[PDB]
Design a protein around this ligand. Structure first.
Ligand SMILES: CS(=O)(=O)Cc1nc2ccccc2[nH]1
Ligand SMILES: CS(=O)(=O)Cc1nc2ccccc2[nH]1
Lengths: 304, 304
């Protein structure tokens, strides 16, 4: 029993983190096979970040200007290319610790683990969600860029995020491992404001199922609702609309608990309208939305 | 910026997890050098757990009855001994992945990372605190016993916890790596009720400093207090008494922020008396107490 915000074990990703330095800028790279992936803004000064022309800045860079260090050992750079907002540094040594891996572009509401790194060294691991406004709420200091987000399915690491930017509001923006930003964000130090940070309804419902499984039951009520009725309330509270696809995804938790998805919606509706009244659910005083239905099943069933 | 509940990177501990089976019981062991450490209740049936005589049960066990598997490779057991509530299984192979390590017995209010495992395979990592009643609020299913808690200082793993028991209230009890339970708990399926789960005041204050550093400032007020006045309010709210030692430990955060510890106490006093009024601090609607002052400094400074 018990339900925690749980990250994936980080060892497979620790074995991929390297330091990348270009001139006076040091950040992290991801070493898979004989390629090191890092944010292209490694080539920028803080001054450059105001209005960078990456193609123009990159002309002044040679392979020997990209210093890549794996632990205390230097890697030889034999090629570089820019793909969207990432650089791919070809090195002459395949990472001997390269796990089975994939690059995946996640959807808003999907969760992942972040291995926060500085100078190519892992500092900590924590669980994130892709917000509906395509930001993440991370923990990233200067030097953390190129830290990655990932999921693990048994022995395959799906890399989904690389850290690039902090917005003036202290939320985070980054790319997939093809270097495409999530959402509208750019790697420039400019006016970039995030949209509404809506609540991931399907994840809240998953977490309420988790709560029932783990004996937190006080919020269960005598009511049901419909998707349309629920959605009128979601809209009012800046929750994401619940779709039949979401109801289908919650089917296994519904089955395990015997609580119909629409009955759990009506519990959530009352919690939104009435608040928690100073009560807690799984140790939280707000409705938690960074567990997916898959996360809840995984943690409640003990997948390794 | 941003402040997350962050675990230590788990790779160094992943490389130490093995499966231990005795008869029909499978749980996890920790393989360091040529010793595998596991809960002594591996020798029990569920029936045995009602009133186990461990010395008597152990007489019926030989080295060859302890099946130890590291990945898909069997380890040869050449000795076993019971130390308090752990078994030490001597194997004929030193763990090649043994990190620098120490065994430490932590104090209530200290935090640590847990690597939740099943069948010797890591499932997830999360951050815990030793509660003032010597329980932890973990995430542990059948098969998770022998999962460990740890801190890392650069390259040295300090192991502080091994998982043994779930209480009927769904909180967790375990031992240090010398097999001594934290608190009054025993490895028997009996009436064991936890005491008051008081709030770790010094950790709340650390987290309020973290909040100020990360731009959450609304709760700062025009008031100060004294330790004695603060402690009258702590007592009323089931907070741990704040000592001068705690004030001293908060000195670096006080210095960084320029907020006197006693002024932050007076902010906490008002939050206790007035509540949050539907506001959040670092994304929480309750006062978080599973960050130590050391955790806040580490995360705010980016230690690897
Ligand atoms: C990337 S490569 O050098 O073209 C081929 C390769 N990929 C590897 C991954 C791990 C170990 C050796 C490996 N050789
Ligand atoms: C424990 S032992 O067999 O007595 C000595 C030992 N400890 C080691 C740790 C890592 C690799 C080889 C090692 N040999």
């Amino acid at each position: 029993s018990g339900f925690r915000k749980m990250a994936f074990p980080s060892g497979k990703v620790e074995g991929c983190m390297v330091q990348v330095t270009c001139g006076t800028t040091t950040l992290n790279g991801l070493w898979l096979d004989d390629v090191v992936y890092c944010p292209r803004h490694v080539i920028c000064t803080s001054e450059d970040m105001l209005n960078p022309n990456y193609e123009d800045l990159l002309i002044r860079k040679s392979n020997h200007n990209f210093l890549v260090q794996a632990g205390n050992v230097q890697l030889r750079v034999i090629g570089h290319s820019m793909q969207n907002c990432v650089l791919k540094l070809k090195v002459d040594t395949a990472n001997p610790k390269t796990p089975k891996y994939k690059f995946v572009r996640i959807q808003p509401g999907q969760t992942f683990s972040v291995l926060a790194c500085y100078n190519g060294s892992p500092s900590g691991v924590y669980q994130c969600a892709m917000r509906p406004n395509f930001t993440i709420k991370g923990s990233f200091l200067n030097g953390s860029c190129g830290s990655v987000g990932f999921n693990i399915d048994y022995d395959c690491v799906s890399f989904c995020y690389m850290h690039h930017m902090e917005l003036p509001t202290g939320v985070h923006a980054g790319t997939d491992l093809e270097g495409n930003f999530y959402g509208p964000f750019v790697d420039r130090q400019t006016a970039q404001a995030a949209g509404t940070d809506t609540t991931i309804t399907v994840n809240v419902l998953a977490w309420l199922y988790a709560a029932v499984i783990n004996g937190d039951r006080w919020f269960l009520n005598r009511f049901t609702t419909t998707l349309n009725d629920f959605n009128l309330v979601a809209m009012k509270y800046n929750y994401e609309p619940l779709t039949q696809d979401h109801v289908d995804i919650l089917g296994p938790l519904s089955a395990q608990t015997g609580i119909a998805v629409l009955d759990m919606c009506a519990s959530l509706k009352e919690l939104l309208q009435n608040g928690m009244n100073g009560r807690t659910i799984l140790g939280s005083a707000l409705l938690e939305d960074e567990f997916t239905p898959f996360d809840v099943v995984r943690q409640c069933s003990g997948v390794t």
